[PDB]
Design a protein around this nucleic acid. Sequence first.
DNA 1: ATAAACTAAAAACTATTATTATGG
DNA 2: CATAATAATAGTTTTTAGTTTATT
Lengths: 232, 7, 69, 23, 505, 210
Amino acid sequence: CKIPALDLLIKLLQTFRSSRLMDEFKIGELFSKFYGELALKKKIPDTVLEKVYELLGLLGEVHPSEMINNAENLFRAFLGELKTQMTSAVREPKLPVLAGCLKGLSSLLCNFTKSMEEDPQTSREIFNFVLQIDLKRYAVPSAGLRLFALHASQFSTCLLDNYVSLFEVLLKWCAHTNVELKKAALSALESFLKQVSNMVAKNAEMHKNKLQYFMEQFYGIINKELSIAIRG
Amino acid sequence: KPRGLFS
Amino acid sequence: RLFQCLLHRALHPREPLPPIQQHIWNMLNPPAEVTTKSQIPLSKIKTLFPLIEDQVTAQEIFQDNHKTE
Amino acid sequence: CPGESLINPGFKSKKPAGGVDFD
Amino acid sequence: GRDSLIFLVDASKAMFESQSEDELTPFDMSIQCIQSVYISKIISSDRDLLAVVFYGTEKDKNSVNFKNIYVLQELDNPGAKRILELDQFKGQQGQKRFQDMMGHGSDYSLSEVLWVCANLFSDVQFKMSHKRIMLFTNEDNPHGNDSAKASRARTKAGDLRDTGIFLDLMHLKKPGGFDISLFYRDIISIAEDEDLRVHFEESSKLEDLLRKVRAKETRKRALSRLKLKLNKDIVISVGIYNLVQKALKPPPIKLYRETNEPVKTKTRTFNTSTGGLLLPSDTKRSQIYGSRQIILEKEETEELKRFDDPGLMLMGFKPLVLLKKHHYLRPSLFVYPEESLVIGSSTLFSALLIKCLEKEVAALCRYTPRRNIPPYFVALVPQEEELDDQKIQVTPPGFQLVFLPFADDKRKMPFTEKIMATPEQVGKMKAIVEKLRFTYRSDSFENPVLQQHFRNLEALALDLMEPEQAVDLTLPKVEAMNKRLGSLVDEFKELVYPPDYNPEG
Amino acid sequence: AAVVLCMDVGFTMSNSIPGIESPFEQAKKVITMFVQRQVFAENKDEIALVLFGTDGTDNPLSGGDQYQNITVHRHLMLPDFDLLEDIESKIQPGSQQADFLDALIVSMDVIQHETIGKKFEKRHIEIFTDLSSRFSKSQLDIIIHSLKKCDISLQFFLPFSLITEQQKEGLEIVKMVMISLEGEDGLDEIYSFSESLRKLCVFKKIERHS
DNA sequence: ATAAACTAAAAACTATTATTATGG
DNA sequence: CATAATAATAGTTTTTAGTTTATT
């Protein structure tokens, strides 16, 4: 397993992302096999080889009920993995590829396999929150933003708390270098404000947070930051 | 010598 | 250390591992009077000897910690 | 090179094993 | 890098003639030397590459298509196939088999062969720590005949020396002796030249070449680039080495019964109760004490193994006299300064070495190899620089890290009452020891287990009918000891043991 | 080996000290650390707990007037985390001031009842108090005799090093008792709570045999 | 009660590759 | 928000701490 394995994985990803929804029905076997071999404790699968996660990230099939069952196993696997990753207590961040691939997977999976009605929702939200200095093109945090950008609705009632932290971190993130990070932050922030406006306008407590922030933030705004404030 | 508590 | 942690977990299987007690370091550390004696020679050697010069991970934290209508 | 196993350059010469030799 | 060694052997009938047929021809014995070298390299360096070529032979084999130059094996890790290929020409009529399938008689250009071996060196896509080539002949007369080709050959050899190629030449069997310097007087790359006689000797250093030394001899690298912290901030890069290291057998390899494929093995952890499949996050470690089955995660165990960061925490200075011999835990390690990360580390290290040698004290230090490890107190003995009669540093300058055991490291022993003996018996023992005294040398022994292991390995690798038997140096010379002593043991036994003592029971 | 804890729980235990813990709290902590070392040990040493000065009486024999206000909290048995929770959570001070000699007879009876058919190369009775609890000196003869018969070692631990007049009187009484039992070296078996805290702040070192 | 291997070896030498300090 | 860029990351081998299984 080397650069060849990685190229093979990305090749599979390209096939799925291009070819889809006509014969992609010979893969639940492949998915089950890959999940099983991943379940092997042997970390011979290299840290770079965590593209496997992006492989298990799937939107190319009906995703049958068996795959749905395995989705929960995958979810808990990611919960444990992010517990390991976030905790520097094990003294091994192992982020480079593992964290980003887990993010991409969890995105592709919880696209249609989750409701904001349970504790694991907020657990994964907390794990996402940590997206701190994150050098080497800041790739992993960016991915997570897209997850939130793709799943802002999945964290309802939990965008409320910690709002100011989310707001400021999103603001600075689109103010960084590496303009891809900036636009990812832009999209995530747009989804963020959309979702919070939706959840607040339907509240009874809307006034509290409404005054606590927003209008004061937007007025404090007064480059494209200004357009951000306009949309806000 | 170690006895009782100390043993 | 293993025994104190095992004790804590058996009595409290709900809490993080207890930190190392300080008397542990006390018999791990030499008599502090020797340290006080060495302090000044430490400084003079440091001045006399010109020396020139990353952690794996400092995670499980993001930075440090968490009206009239 | 003196004092070097020519078989293994960068490695000192390897003496014969030998054994107990009473004095 | 690796070592590039090419065994260059003539095929021009200069190896077929013999002083007598009871003595090996200059050819076959060279084959035996080369095979012994292959075996020794297998024992020592797998990653090295060795090559063998023939020149003057009637035909040729080389990419450059230079005639009369036939490479037998190219720069590669030694293989038993190569060794048996040599063996088919080894010994009597092996040179006849050679003549049948290879032949000889033609001339050559030493410039041409130097070109060919330079091509071989350029061929390898791997970094060579050394550029060695080994020439086998007893004769320099072929180019001793024409001055033009000799001049071209020496110019080429100088060029190759410029490239870093080190040419070495051996004394070979010749009835008229080697008679050096007919051509080869300054066409040899030599760091210490002392051969100027005709040297009718049929050998120069072929003895150890044939000698089968059994050792791995791994290349030197620091066991840890640790940091020596004096208090918290006077830190120096320091190199730690296992100046000795108990060697063990290479691990077995899982091979198939019919194809002997290295078998890919996989030990999945799975739920046998449901027949399902488990994950590392799907399990928890446990230990049960008394009525309580205490359940944890492995990680939590790791962080409760976290005490100190990797480094050296100086705990103070203790005189070397305060050391008990029986207080030994595990083999000591060497300490060396490193300027790679801290400059001035070596100056300070030298100062400390000299000072501890003067005051005769050891710097007791709290030592942490790497993370998740309880730090240990170890005594660092100032280790002097010792140079032999050849001024070769036999004992490096540095420090001796000896592990200081803890309270639990001892064990209570059912001691026995102290009993004395007559001083006459003490003198008997003194005389007997003087009889059986022997001078100690470090390399005085080998593990006979590992020895016979390698013997069997070689035998099967050479598919022999029967393996050579390793000698057990560890076996005492009981007959020699009885010869040395006589009845001194009987006299002492009567002095001590009453004539009813059971030797064992 | 058999170890027995004859513990004062009387109100004199309840009295805290501005400089050190109460004799009750010091005794609790020392028992806790000792039993922690025992449970983490695989020595399988049976341990008994006897509490004198308790409000009620709880003994194999409660006598007519002796053995009163004394509770056998735990019988001689191997320790566990359950025992530790009992030490920390269940051990509470009593109001009575019972004769510690009556609890000592309780302990010798318990040992004689529980050392039967036991590989107990040692027998131990450890008493924690400040010696201000009330007592009667009439049983000294029979106690010393039966202690020398059943071969039980005795240890005293105190909130003070080797105090009120009652504490001094009890100190002299235990001095004469232990001098009779084991001579002047008996004075070496009387300790303080602080010294036991410092000495048992660490678990025993694991050791086996070849 | 484990003296052989129990079980997988925590670690740099010596070689490459995506980052962007910037080029514009 | 473009482009001769550039370089901090990683991934191969070693050699410690886990453990069976008889061993008394």
